[PDB]
Amino acid sequence: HWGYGKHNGPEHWHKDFPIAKGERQSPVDIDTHTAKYDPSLKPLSVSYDQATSLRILNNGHAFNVEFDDSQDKAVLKGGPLDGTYRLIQFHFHWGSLDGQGSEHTVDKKKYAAELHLVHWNTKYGDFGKAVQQPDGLAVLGIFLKVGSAKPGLQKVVDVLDSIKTKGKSADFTNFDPRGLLPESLDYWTYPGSLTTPPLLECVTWIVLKEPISVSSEQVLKFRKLNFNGEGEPEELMVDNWRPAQPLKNRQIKASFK
Numbered sequence: 001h002w003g004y005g006k007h008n009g010p011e012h013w014h015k016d017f018p019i020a021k022g023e024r025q026s027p028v029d030i031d032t033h034t035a036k037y038d039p040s041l042k043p044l045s046v047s048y049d050q051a052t053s054l055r056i057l058n059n060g061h062a063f064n065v066e067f068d069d070s071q072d073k074a075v076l077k078g079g080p081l082d083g084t085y086r087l088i089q090f091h092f093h094w095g096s097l098d099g100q101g102s103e104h105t106v107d108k109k110k111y112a113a114e115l116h117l118v119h120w121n122t123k124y125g126d127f128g129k130a131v132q133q134p135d136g137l138a139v140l141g142i143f144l145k146v147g148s149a150k151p152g153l154q155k156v157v158d159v160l161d162s163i164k165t166k167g168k169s170a171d172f173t174n175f176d177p178r179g180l181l182p183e184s185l186d187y188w189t190y191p192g193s194l195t196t197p198p199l200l201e202c203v204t205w206i207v208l209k210e211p212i213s214v215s216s217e218q219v220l221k222f223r224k225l226n227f228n229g230e231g232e233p234e235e236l237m238v239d240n241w242r243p244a245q246p247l248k249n250r251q252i253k254a255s256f257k
């Protein structure tokens with residue numbers, strides 16, 4: 001019964017998920033001054049040309065675009081990774097207002113939203129086994145700022161009317177996630193966790209330096225989704241972000257000077 005409300009939100013999660021107070025929780029604030037450039041970091045290899053999107057689902061917390069992960073169709077390699085990580089889904093976190101919504105912050109600045117492309121380490125065979133491992137997942141995080149529209153996001157925006165409430169899904173084949181990326185692949189990286197329950201500490205976080213710009217209308221339509229199921233009282237799906245958590249002496253590395 002976790003969520004983002006006053007009664008079941010981030011302050012409450014530790015009671016059912018005590019790792020919420022763990023040693024490598026996410027998100028964090030990225031202090032750019034103290035993140036150190038690491039010349040041993042490799043460029044990120046994003047290979048999405050064979051991606052097979054399947055479906056979009058309102059899960060009561062966000063909406064997820066799911067992919068076929070039964071072969072190496074859409075993979076993340078390189079960067080800080082030492083393995084091949086398959087794309088399973090992407091989703092966003094966003095605010096009720098343009099001035100909040102991201103999970104990670106940059107020098108304490110919040111963005112309007114944050115995109116998470118979730119990948120699992122193929123040496124563990126399936127996502128379920130990967131989330132039992134400290135290097136099971138790699139999440140590529142991309143900030144959204146409000147400005148000009150993002151053309152590659154519009155197909156997502158225009159299906160949202162058909163998944164308004166929790167438990168609704170719709171076909172979402174032939175979506176190209178390359179249209180959600182910024183120009184640069186420069187990144188920060190650190191070891192962390194899932195940002196929602198069960199808060200498992202599996203994730204190599206890779207957060208891109210360059211935000212994407214989306215229009216006010218695009219993010220406005222995210223905010224018309226509902227946390228509730230059909231026939232229940234309407235609760236707008238807004239402010240589905242966890243605040244920054246203690247760094248606990250982790251270090252954040254930068255791929256760029």
Ligand SMILES: CCCCOc1ccc(S(N)(=O)=O)cc1
Pocket residue numbers: 116118131139193194195196197198
């Ligand atoms: C068994 C795990 C199910 C939940 O999976 C997830 C996957 C990714 C995230 S995030 N927001 O850290 O990208 C949160 C939950």
Ligand code: NA
Pocket residue numbers: 034035036251252
């Ligand atoms: Na540092």
Ligand code: NA
Pocket residue numbers: 070071
């Ligand atoms: Na297959």
Ligand SMILES: [Zn+2]
Pocket residue numbers: 091092093116195
């Ligand atoms: Zn997320």
